[PDB]
């Protein structure tokens, strides 16, 4: 029957109502959302006419959910929790309305049976460190130092904590409420498990490890964040894309063709030149070419990826002629012809490779189509619920920010940056505000959690479904060895700042006799092998720059340096040296090989998105430092600015923002960052507020603009990036007996943890009594039972048993914590014993395992360190390598507040370099990191080295571009590698 | 309990020593007896008051007529400068010559002046050229500003010109619309300089007529947030922009229409109502769903009362919203069918809603429409709309070009405080042909010039008249311009709590005691007539401490030129005045001789009044170097005086030889006195001589006569008049100075009534209250008290350590008792100008309740018994004769267990009074009769949103 359809069109048109109103703050209605609620009878109506309907022939779980829904809705217009579950659930019903989305849900929730035991570890992982950090950073972040005397307030926009380090410029500081407005905090195990889950996901999580680096000190906080990063989130995304797929597993004329290749290779070359502040002439010509091309291509379209080709060439014609009768805005379809660049591979074989590539594309595009619209349903349900709970609640005292619920777009918006997991912490703290502090409003930390955690199981079926159709469509040596460890070593103890010190000095002469055994092995190699009769290329021009850096060692401050960056390469020679590595290195090579035929295509989608976006923003991204000046010619002179409750004179300056279109260059950089992950929705604000070519931009002036950001995130992300790992997969298949004493133990270990999650900030004193009687009682009970394990055992055969010993470390580690804990006399606040609250902490490490946790998981289960982990030793290279590329050439930069390079993220030690490329592989803000490393740069005093110039040269290179580029795209390129090398350890456990 | 006519007795017996230890020590009948006795070296002339007043009005008027025939010409010219211009979009090759103050450029070249040190000004200045100022916000180099300093670098003729003409000029300013303003003589600018010419009272005075604006505030939910402190900054920042001449209220809606604070309907929009109006609007919140219709009717319905005092000119209503779609076409075609009131909307905060029904009900109704996304806008924004009140204005023509006088307000310049002339300039550019008629609707700007009170003052010369007897000119508003209370301080408002633009208004009746009398001459004095009233009043001293009763005589006339009034305020006793008449050199040297610091053994320590004799002497305000130069000069510059007024020199002369000969002849004689410490004499030349010159040291009072308070006192008084010391250590005197006690000398010339100087004495406190023991008695307790409860001594020699001391601080209930008994009455005051210390949430000036007490009625004896609870108190209270003196005993506080809240005389801090209620009875006052509104010919083809 029809009737089932009028149903459907019911349900479309109520989501279409739901997708129009907006909420206002305080109980404030628009006009437009009172004819919208006029109608709320008339769709419930026949909601519920349909439940008798079918009631009185019937007498499933969505059957349920439709009664549920109305039932609600009908209470709901006799008066609110109770507008909620009939409003935001309700376009959940167009999936039991057809039966093609039904199969399609059973298909995704048929493979969470071993994802949802595998979480279960990440919730316990998270149980530890929120334990551990506890102990630690309890009550230690609640003092930043103000000291206006005039307010008695203000201070640093990111408030600095005093802890036990001081602040610098003076000041003093009273209680602070805490640093993300007391809600990023290790108080309780609440507040631990949010704090260290919102740091496994990597975001904020440097943040963190600065607040509590300035409080206790920069010497082992990074022992508790950087495992945290890699123990927890490396290894947990690496484990659910393992088990995920171990259920997976089980006209005619050639001379026509090239002059109409030729012909197109033009067309994209036309509209790769434009750019902002182009030459009029060029303009012309440009303008003349385009209809040239547009009247060719219809003209060979009348005598002839055809189909592809098709509606590019005809969609020209119909944009040309609609833009033509509205000057403005150009969006821009012509660059689309560019994708017979695909078609050009049979001139320069490897055609049935494309083939193969284009096929399996299409197909995997495809069999997404049914997921990727249950995915948005999720995605709509999801903005509906933010709109019910955070909508009209944002209006705060400093404005309402860019990432709100108040209207649909809005909160779809919304919805989909934190699904993209890009600063959704930012927002749960908007959240957490809006619903009432710290006090009252931390329950809405639960809908951000939630919704971070689809996020995850997105990306994980979608991935399946990719792999899934893929198979479908698949059919003396030591002391040389060692004077380059050692020459390695010397590389990383330099400081940048001092050229002419101690170190340097007795380092020159360590680096003297290095060029001098390298230059040995040199004359040594040169009569064996006779020359030539590659890496020893690199060998011999790492050997003469040497030699030239010494020659014309004895103008010298500027033009010498570059010579001396060769030198980073001495690491690089280990890999021939061992065959070990060079198998590894073998290996990604050959990988990269593999997978070069996808980047190709890979490079031509991220070439057509640049050049649609130049036509689209081009010079819109200009701005004045004062919002009252929309030019460049009234943009000048001086304004009084009111920011920050502070009044003060600045100058007006035409600026423009720091990721831009204005290039094809400066466009496919900006698209490389947003793909990243980092920054993009400033990126995304910044294009919405675009007015005119040489205007200054109006906030919200233009919100379709998200939709170019939106196809790019689906395209280029959630598709390109795992088809990468899909196909080098495919490629990668061819190569004390008493059970009551038992039980006793078991159990108290669990008393023992509860009592070990309790301990919290200002608790009565009473409750620190309590806890410490606890302590030392199971501390007592534990030593009991090792003496009786040890007098039914036997002294020497106790330690039998990695478990016992490990037991009976911690014992002996607790009697000596417990009797030092009290201690008198021998209190020595210098010798502050606090390293053994570790085995208290860790009592649980061995409670855990109850059942077999460990076997549950894949690569923890199986060998995860048999030979693959090899891999691991190139990435440390790597990472060595950038640190000394980055002291030698960004060390001497400036420190200073208001940048991303300051004491706590710089260049200056070797520690620090490494630390600041740990965070930038991860991601924070690594384009603002590149932005910080630029040219004409502050420079660091040089107290040594006496000279008459105090400018001298600026500091601060522009190969900061190049830098931060492929060392992201190598990094990358290494998990990848490092992730498959873990595919095959665990090869034959999956079979 | 002692008898009462034993009591009657010893307080005579007291009284007749007190009465005859000071005549014969003062030695009052002495200088009656020498005065009457020359009665050669001076004449007696009258000081009529009708003449007078005439000649002051007449003088003060001529000086306004200079004024504005400056301002005329001022403005004559810069219309015919501006009519004649090219509007160069250049300036690279013709740069233009200006001076720019504020600096420590293309299009423009600097100027460096000498800056020499000129007198009537506290600052350095150069008359060579014009000093520039340009606000921060305004960038100077742009097409406008350099159209502006090229067109109006020619009005640096008419500057010196004007100068020229008249030496005595202060600044002449002129108030671009651009922002600039150009004044001369050239001067530099005074943290963050936020001044701006355009929001300058004068000019706001000079742009537009009076208006009668009512805002409107949309308080609902959508406004919730940062837009919310953005409206009601700017609300505060539209309310900075109105006057006293103008009337506002302000409203809010949201489905309801109400008034933010207590008002209900337009109040006058003075420095009070606009406080209470800023206060209100910084306490509302955002709520509910918005309504115009309900608030738009409740606007317009009170904009059309009529029954409370209004200003019968521009009605406009300040819409500040943020968006909506609602139109209320109805609404608009329902009030204002025929336009009669203007409508500005605003749209505030940053928001995507619909502006379009704003700014359609903004430029429907002959407003304007403006947008205010941030703080910065705030300042700009608020203040716009005066260029579209002026449209009548300018399209009136020569009609609406009057000289406007604003308040009384401190200048911007530091030069005290001034009033400001002006005169509206207007765009004449094509009017030869009368073609364009499309920008010529702004004014160009406004032209101003200032007047100093200072220059008032020397008009109204008052060393002809006695102390007692003052000037005082009065406003259409009521305010004084000026009066002897008024100060170079802003008159406070509300509590100075802690977490120079708003104007010295102090009105006629808040400057004095506050009559019913006063009242009516009040009201026959603002609206402009003649008159004459003499009655008897009480008036308070210098000193917040004392109040008199005195018979005064009010005489007043209006000045033609202006709407002000001027009064003269003159006592009896003062209708005749001394005048010395003498031509010879010897008798002037013989006088000045006896002068000289070092001649002061043999005639007491004299001191001198820094009076203007003539321009060479300088006034150092130190009268131990201010004596020397007098003197020198005295003994230095010729007798014939070309340049040296010989009145007040032949009056000093005359005085001082009196007051020698009377030192030499009478004082001399009795070189030490056991109960006196100290004898002095205090003239009307100007002249105290303190006979102990040791004593001198001791003389913590001012130099010149017309400023000392118990001079004032005496004069008023008829008896003998004792002033209490200061308490908490105020300086020395405490035991070292005594109790002063004067007594005014009266003279018969011919039957005529004259008080020329007040004689007196430092009286011993150690042998008074040695006199009054003839001690620690703890079963009854003694004390004297003068006219306003100020102890004297007592008998158990603890209340002697607080001396002079009020008697409700010590010993409340007998204080609290006497006042109940109407044996004293009680007056209080508001002081609008005094500082105060900050509270809780430097020094700010906030308002301060004065009490003052007096004797209440004219009997002597005073008996009564006090009941404090299970307690008697019996006491007595006699009063002595020929004095401001009384003596009250009681027994002793310590019998009965009981005690009162203490009763506290002194500078009590307070708000007061409450203006919900004062504005249902306000003061009587006039505003203007000219307006200037609802022009055919005006264009308001113009929103503020098509322009955009
Ligand atoms: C007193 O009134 C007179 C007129 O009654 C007025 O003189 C007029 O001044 C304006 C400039 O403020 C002249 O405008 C010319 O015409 C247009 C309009 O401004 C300008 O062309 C551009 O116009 C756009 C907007 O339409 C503007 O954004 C842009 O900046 C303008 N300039 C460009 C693009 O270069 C012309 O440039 C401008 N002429 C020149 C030489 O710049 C009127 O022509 C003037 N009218 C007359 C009759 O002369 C005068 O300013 C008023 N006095 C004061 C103090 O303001
Ligand atoms: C406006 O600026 C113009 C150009 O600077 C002034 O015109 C010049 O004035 C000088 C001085 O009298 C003459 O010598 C030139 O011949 C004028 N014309 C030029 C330079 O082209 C003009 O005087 C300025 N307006 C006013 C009111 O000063
Ligand atoms: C200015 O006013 C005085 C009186 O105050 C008058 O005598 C004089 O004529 C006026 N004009 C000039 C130029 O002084
Ligand atoms: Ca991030
Ligand atoms: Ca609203």
């Not at chain 1, 579950?85 to 049976?113: C, D, E, F, T, Y």
């Not at chain 2, 006219?787 to 607080?802: E, K, S």
């Amino acid at each position: 029957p029809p009737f089932e359809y009028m149903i459907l069109a019911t349900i479309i048109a109520n989501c279409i109502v739901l997708a129009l109103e907006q909420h206002l703050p305080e109980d404030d209605k628009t006009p437009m959302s009172r004819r919208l609620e006029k109608t709320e009878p008339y769709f419930i109506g026949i909601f519920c006419f349909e439940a008798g309907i079918k009631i009185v022939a019937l007498g499933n779980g969505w059957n349920v959910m439709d009664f549920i829904v109305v039932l609600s809705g009908i209470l709901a217009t006799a008066g609110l929790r109770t507008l909620r579950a009939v409003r935001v659930l309700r376009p959940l019903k167009l999936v039991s309305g057809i039966p093609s989305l039904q199969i399609v849900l059973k298909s995704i929730m048929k493979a969470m049976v071993p994802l949802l035991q595998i979480g279960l570890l990440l919730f316990f992982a998270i149980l530890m460190f929120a334990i551990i950090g506890l102990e630690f950073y309890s009550g230690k972040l609640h003092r930043a130092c103000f000291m206006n005397n005039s307010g008695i307030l203000e201070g640093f926009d990111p408030p600095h904590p005093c802890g036990v380090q001081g602040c610098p410029a003076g000041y003093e500081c009273k209680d602070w409420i805490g640093p993300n407005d007391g809600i990023t905090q290790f108080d309780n195990i609440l507040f631990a498990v949010l704090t260290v889950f919102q740091c496994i996901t990597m975001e904020g999580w440097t943040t963190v490890l600065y607040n509590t680096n300035d409080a206790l000190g920069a010497t082992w906080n990074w022992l508790y964040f950087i495992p945290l990063i890699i123990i927890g989130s490396f290894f947990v995304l690496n484990l659910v894309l393992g088990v995920l797929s171990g259920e997976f597993a089980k006209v005619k004329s050639q001379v026509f063709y090239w002059i109409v290749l030729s012909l197109v290779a033009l067309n994209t070359a036309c509209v790769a030149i434009v750019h902002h502040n182009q030459p009029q002439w060029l303009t012309h010509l440009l303008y003349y070419a385009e209809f040239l091309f547009l009247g060719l291509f219809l003209l060979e379209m009348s005598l002839k990826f055809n189909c592809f080709d098709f509606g590019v060439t005809v969609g020209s014609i119909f944009e040309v002629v609609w833009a033509i009768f509205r000057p403005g805005t150009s969006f821009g379809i012509s660059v689309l012809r560019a994708l017979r660049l695909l078609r050009i591979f049979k001139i320069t074989k490897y055609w049935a490779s494309l083939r193969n590539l284009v096929v399996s594309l299409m197909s995997s595009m495809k069999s997404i189509i049914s997921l990727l619209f249950l995915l948005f349903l999720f995605i709509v349900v999801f903005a509906l619920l933010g709109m019910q709970l955070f909508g009209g609640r944002f209006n705060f005292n400093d404005g309402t920010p860019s990432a709100n619920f108040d209207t649909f777009p809005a909160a779809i918006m919304t919805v989909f940056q934190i699904l993209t997991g890009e600063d959704w912490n930012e927002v749960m703290y908007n959240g957490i505000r809006s619903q009432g502090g710290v006090s009252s409003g931390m329950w809405s930390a639960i809908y951000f959690i939630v919704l971070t955690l689809f996020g995850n199981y997105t990306l994980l079926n979608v991935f399946l479904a990719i792999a899934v159709d893929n198979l479908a469509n698949a059919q003396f040596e030591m002391c040389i060895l060692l004077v380059i460890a050692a020459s390695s070593i010397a590389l990383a103890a330099e400081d940048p700042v001092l050229t002419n010190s101690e170190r340097n000095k007795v380092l020159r002469y360590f680096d003297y006799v290095f060029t001098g055994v390298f230059t040995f092995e040199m004359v040594i190699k040169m009569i064996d092998q006779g020359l030539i009769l590659l890496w020893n290329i690199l060998d011999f021009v790492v050997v003469v720059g040497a030699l030239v850096a010494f020659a014309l060692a004895n103008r010298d401050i500027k033009t010498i340096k570059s010579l001396r960056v060769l030198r980073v390469l001495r690491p690089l020679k280990t890999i021939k040296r061992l065959p070990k590595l060079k198998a590894v290195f073998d290996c990604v090579v050959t990988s990269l090989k593999n997978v070069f035929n996808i980047l190709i295509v890979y490079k031509l989608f991220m070439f057509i998105f640049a050049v649609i976006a130049v036509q689209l923003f081009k010079g819109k991204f200009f701005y004045c430092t004062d919002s009252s000046k929309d030019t460049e010619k009234e943009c000048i002179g001086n304004y009084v600015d009111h920011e920050k409750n502070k009044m003060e004179v600045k100058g007006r300056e035409w600026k423009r923002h720091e990721f831009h279109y204005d290039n094809i260059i400066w466009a496919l950089l900006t698209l490389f960052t947003v793909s990243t992950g980092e920054g993009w929705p400033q990126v995304l604000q910044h294009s919405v507020d675009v007015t005119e070519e040489d205007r200054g931009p109006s906030r919200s002036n233009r919100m379709e603009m998200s939709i170019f950001y939106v196809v790019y995130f689906v395209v280029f992300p959630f598709f390109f990036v795992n088809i990468f790992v899909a196909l080098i997969i495919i490629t990668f298949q061819e190569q004390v007996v008493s059970p009551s004493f038992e039980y006793t133990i078991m159990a108290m270990i669990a008393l023992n943890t509860v009592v070990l999650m309790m301990k919290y900030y200002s608790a009565p004193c009473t409750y620190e009594l309590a806890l410490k009687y606890l302590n030392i009682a199971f501390t007592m009970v534990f030593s009991l039972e090792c003496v009786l394990k040890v007098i039914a055992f036997g002294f020497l055969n106790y330690f039998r048993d990695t478990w016992n010993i490990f037991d009976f470390i911690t014992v002996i580690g607790s009697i000596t914590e417990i009797i030092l804990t009290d201690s008198k006399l021998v209190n020595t606040s210098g010798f502050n014993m606090s390293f053994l609250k570790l085995f208290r902490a860790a009592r649980l490490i061995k409670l855990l395992r109850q059942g077999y946790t460990i076997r549950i998981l894949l690569w923890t289960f199986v060998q995860s360190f048999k030979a693959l982990p090899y891999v691991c030793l190139l990435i440390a290279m790597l990472f060595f390598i950038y640190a000394i590329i980055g002291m030698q050439v960004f060390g001497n930069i400036k420190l200073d507040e208001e940048s991303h390079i300051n004491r706590h993220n710089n260049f200056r030690s070797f520690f620090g370099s490494l630390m600041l490329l740990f965070r930038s592989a991860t991601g924070e803000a690594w384009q603002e990191i590149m932005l910080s490393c630029l040219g004409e740069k502050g420079c660091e005093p040089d107290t040594t080295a006496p000279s008459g110039q105090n400018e001298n040269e600026r500091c601060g290179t522009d190969l900061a571009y190049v830098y931060f580029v492929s060392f992201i795209f190598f990094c990358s390129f290494l998990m990848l590698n490092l992730f498959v090398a873990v595919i095959m350890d665990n090869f034959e456990y999956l079979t | 309990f002692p008898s009462a006519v034993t009591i009657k007795s010893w307080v005579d017996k007291m009284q007749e020593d007190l009465v005859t230890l000071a005549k014969t020590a003062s030695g009052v009948n002495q200088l009656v007896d020498i005065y009457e006795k020359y009665q050669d070296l001076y004449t007696v002339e009258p000081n009529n008051a009708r003449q007078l007043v005439e000649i002051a009005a007449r003088d003060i008027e001529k000086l306004l007529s200079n004024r504005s025939k400056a301002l005329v010409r001022l403005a004559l010219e810069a219309e015919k400068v501006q009519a004649a211009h090219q509007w160069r979009e250049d300036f690279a090759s013709n740069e233009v010559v200006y001076y720019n103050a504020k600096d420590d450029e293309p299009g423009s070249q600097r100027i460096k002046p000498v800056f020499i040190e000129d007198a009537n000004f506290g600052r350095q200045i150069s008359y060579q050229h014009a000093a520039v100022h340009i606000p921060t916000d305004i960038y100077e180099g742009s097409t406008i500003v350099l159209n502006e300093l090229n067109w109006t670098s020619a009005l640096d003729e008419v500057f010196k010109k004007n100068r020229e003409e008249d030496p005595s000029l202060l600044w002449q300013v002129f108030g671009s619309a651009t922002g600039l303003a150009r004044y001369y003589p050239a001067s530099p600018w005074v943290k963050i300089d936020l001044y701006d010419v355009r929001r300058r009272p004068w000019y706001i005075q000079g742009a537009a007529s009076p208006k009668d604006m009512l805002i409107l505030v949309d308080v609902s939910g959508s406004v919730s947030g940062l837009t919310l402190k953005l409206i009601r900054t700017s609300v505060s920042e539209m309310l900075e922009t109105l006057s006293d001449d103008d009337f506002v209220n302000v409203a809010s809606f949201n489905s309801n229409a109400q008034d933010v604070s207590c008002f209900q309907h337009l109040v006058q929009a003075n420095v009070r109502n606009k406080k209470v109006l800023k206060d209100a609007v910084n306490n509302i919140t955002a709520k509910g769903i918005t309504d115009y219709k309900k608030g738009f009717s409740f606007a317009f319905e009170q904009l059309l009362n009529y029954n409370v005092s209004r200003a019968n000119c521009n009605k406009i209503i300040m819409l500040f919203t943020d968006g909506g779609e609602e139109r209320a076409q109805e609404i608009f075609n329902k009030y204002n069918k025929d336009k009669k009131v203007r409508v500005f909307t605003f749209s505030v905060g940053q928001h995507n809603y619909d502006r379009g029904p704003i700014q359609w009900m903004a430029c429907e109704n002959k407003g304007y429409y403006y947008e205010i996304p941030s703080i910065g806008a705030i300042r700009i924004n608020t203040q716009e709309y005066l260029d579209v009140l002026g449209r009548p204005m300018v399209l009136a023509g020569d009609k609406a070009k009057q000289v406007q006088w604003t308040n009384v307000y401190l200048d911007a310049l530091e030069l005290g405080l001034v009033i400001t002339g002006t005169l509206p300039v207007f765009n004449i550019t094509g009017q030869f042909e009368n073609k364009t008629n499309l920008k010529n609707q702004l004014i160009l700007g406004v032209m101003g010039v200032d007047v100093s009170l200072e220059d008032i003052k020397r008009l109204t010369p008052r060393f002809t008249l006695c102390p007692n007897g003052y000037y005082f000119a009065i406003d259409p508003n009521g305010y004084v311009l000026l009066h002897p209370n008024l100060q170079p301080k802003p008159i406070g408002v509300g509590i100075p709590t802690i977490n120079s633009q708003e104007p010295v208004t102090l009105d006629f009746l808040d400057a004095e005691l506050e009559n019913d009398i006063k009242v009516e001459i009040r009201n026959k004095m603002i609206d402009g007539e003649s008159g004459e009233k003499t009655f008897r009043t009480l008036v308070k001293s210098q000193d917040e401490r004392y109040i008199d009763k005195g018979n005064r005589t009010y005489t007043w006339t209006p000045v033609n030129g202006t709407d002000y009034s001027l009064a003269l305020v003159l006592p009896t006793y003062s209708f005749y005045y001394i005048k010395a008449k003498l031509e010879e050199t010897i008798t002037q040297a013989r006088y000045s001789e006896t002068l000289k610091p070092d001649n002061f053994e043999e005639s007491g320590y004299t001191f001198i009044a820094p009076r203007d004799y003539c321009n060479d002497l300088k006034i150092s305000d130190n009268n131990t170097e201010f004596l020397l130069n007098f003197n020198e000069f005295i003994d230095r510059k010729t007798p014939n005086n070309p340049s040296c007024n010989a009145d007040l020199i032949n009056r000093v002369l005359l005085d001082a030889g009196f007051t020698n000969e009377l030192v030499q002849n009478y004082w001399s004689k009795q070189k030490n006195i056991k109960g006196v410490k100290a004898r002095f004499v205090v003239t009307d030349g100007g002249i105290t001589r303190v006979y102990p010159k040791e004593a001198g040291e001791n003389w913590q009072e001012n130099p010149e006569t017309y400023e000392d308070s118990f001079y004032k006192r005496s004069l008023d008084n008829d008896n003998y008049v004792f002033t209490a010391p200061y308490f908490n250590k105020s300086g020395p005197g405490a035991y070292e100075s005594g109790i002063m006690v004067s007594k005014a000398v009266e003279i018969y010339i011919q039957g005529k009534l004259l008080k020329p100087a007040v004689v007196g004495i430092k009286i011993d406190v150690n042998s008074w209250i040695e006199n009054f023991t003839k001690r620690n008695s703890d079963v009854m307790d003694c004390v004297i008290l003068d006219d306003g409860g100020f102890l004297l001594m007592a008998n158990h020699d603890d209340y002697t350590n607080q001396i002079g001391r009020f008697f409700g601080e010590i010993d409340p209930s007998l204080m609290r008792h006497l006042v109940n008994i109407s044996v004293y009455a009680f007056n209080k005051s508001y002081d609008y100008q005094s500082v105060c210390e900050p509270g809780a949430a430097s020094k700010q000036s906030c308002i301060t309740e004065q009490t003052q007490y007096f004797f209440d009625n004219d009997s002597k004896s005073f008996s009564g018994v006090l009941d404090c609870g299970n307690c008697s108190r019996i006491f007595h209270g006699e009063k002595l004769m020929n004095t401001n003196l009384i003596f009250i005993m009681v027994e002793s506080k310590g019998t009965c267990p009981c005690d009162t809240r203490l009763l506290i005389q002194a500078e009590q801090t307070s708000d007061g009074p409450n203006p919900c209620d004062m504005v249902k009875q306000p003061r009587y006052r006039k505003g203007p009769d000219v307006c200037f509104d609802n022009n055919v010919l005006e264009d308001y083809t113009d929103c503020g949103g098509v322009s955009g």
